[PDB]
Design a protein around this ligand. Structure first.
Ligand SMILES: *[C@@H]1O[C@H](CO)[C@@H](O)[C@H](O)[C@H]1NC(C)=O
Ligand SMILES: *[C@@H]1O[C@H](CO)[C@@H](O)[C@H](O)[C@H]1NC(C)=O
Lengths: 50, 50, 47, 50
């Protein structure tokens, strides 16, 4: 899931506080949260290989 | 007959209903009501000079 | 010799055109300042 | 800029802000004021898309 236009830190804080309107949660672990210019991508592992 | 005339547009209102005030919460997403003006948002100290 | 590895002409072309959006995760411009437009400030639903 | 500025238009409503309409009026009248705003905003978005 890509949360468009938002910083991953804010999304993680909102998740921990149970402040988000969608009540589903993507399981979050290390290496599954990646910040891109399109938004915060949770549920995909970023790799160096192109 | 009594006609009660009033303007609801000007910001510096002086006649409010008997609604109780709460404390002031800053830096959190809060549903606020300031003299009848309502909304949802994060309140912070302003650097604006009113 | 410079980041982005663009040609001298490309560097000139990019500096001469002024972008309005320059989209990024622009959540740092939402406090204080002058809350400059951009044109919905990510507040009125336009991104 | 045009699409955002159109949000301040009343389109015949007592106020361009939905919170003021809902705060001042009971649903049977608030719905009328809101329908006026919905029509104006829908026209603004349809124009934008075209
Ligand atoms: C996210 O927020 C942190 C501060 O909490 C900041 O250092 C970082 O640059 C931000 N990232 C983006 C993409 O806005
Ligand atoms: C890619 O390689 C660099 C080498 O310095 C490393 O710092 C970075 O964490 C690597 N990223 C991934 C996703 O493996």
């Amino acid at each position: 899931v890509l949360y468009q236009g938002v910083n991953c830190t804010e999304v993680s804080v909102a998740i921990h506080a149970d402040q988000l309107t969608p009540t589903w949660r993507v399981y979050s672990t290390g290496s599954n949260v990646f910040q891109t210019r399109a938004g915060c991508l949770i549920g995909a592992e970023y790799v160096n290989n192109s | 007959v009594v006609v009660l005339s009033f303007e609801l547009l000007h910001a510096p209102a002086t006649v409010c209903g008997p609604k109780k005030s709460t404390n002031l919460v800053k830096n959190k997403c809060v549903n606020f009501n300031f003299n009848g003006l309502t909304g949802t948002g994060v309140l912070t100290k302003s650097n604006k000079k009113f | 010799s410079k980041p982005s590895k663009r040609s001298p002409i490309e560097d000139l072309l990019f500096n001469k055109v002024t972008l309005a959006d320059a989209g990024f995760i622009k959540q740092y411009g939402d406090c204080l300042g002058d809350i400059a437009a951009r044109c919905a400030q990510k507040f009125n639903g336009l991104t | 800029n045009t699409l955002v500025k159109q949000l301040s238009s009343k389109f015949g409503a007592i106020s361009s802000v939905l919170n003021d309409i809902l705060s001042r009026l009971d649903p049977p009248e608030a719905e009328v004021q809101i329908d006026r705003l919905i029509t104006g905003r829908l026209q603004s978005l349809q124009t934008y898309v075209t």
